[PDB]
Design a protein around this ligand. Sequence first.
Ligand SMILES: [Zn+2]
Ligand SMILES: [Zn+2]
Length: 258
Amino acid sequence: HHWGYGKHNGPEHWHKDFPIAKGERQSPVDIDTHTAKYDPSLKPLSVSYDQATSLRILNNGHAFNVEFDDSQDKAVLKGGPLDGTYRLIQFHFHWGSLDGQGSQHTVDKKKYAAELHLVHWNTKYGDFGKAVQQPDGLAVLGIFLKVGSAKPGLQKVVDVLDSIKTKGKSADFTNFDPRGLLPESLDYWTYPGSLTTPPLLECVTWIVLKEPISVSSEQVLKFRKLNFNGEGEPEELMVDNWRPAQPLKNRQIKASFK
Ligand SMILES: [Zn+2]
Ligand SMILES: [Zn+2]
């Protein structure tokens, strides 16, 4: 029926409604560190989030999105492998039912507890909807989460989860600064890919940070308490909202570091 992460509508079935699932530039992938090519022509990333305006948080039935005002160049990403300015629209996570799984991307087959996705769209296309139809329409920063020490900057997000428990619920979520979720180093790997969920469009330049951020057990614990279902429907915990690694095919992963 409609796509999700269960046995009956899970990743292995998406291709029936989204044939691009079997495409040539699907995500996520396993990052083989010994085959990734250092490319010294890659520029340092430029993250300008000082004017970031968060507006809302929503449980859309497959994750929780924190949405930003993208009506202007307030929070942008540039540099790295990018040409042009990319505007932040929303961030969300992918996580597991257990600490040993949850991330999309893997590093030498290692899975992390979760993966944060900061989604940006190429301003040359004027709106998000047009940007997704272009090969260079989006730029996604992926940040791994390992369980260890608590991440202070994530707490405001954790505490509001109770109020958007089920699908379709939203809550005002202003004055959240995304800079509290960045690791210390901005070293990355990059490759041409796609959205990790339906519609799986091949419009993303992926920028995966080498350094993971740490979250406490209790923080990741609150993620696992959300529900995939709407209110008054049988309870299905939101967990394991991730997709297995896709073949690399004709692609090269480049590293900004050696
Ligand atoms: Zn994602
Ligand atoms: Zn596209």
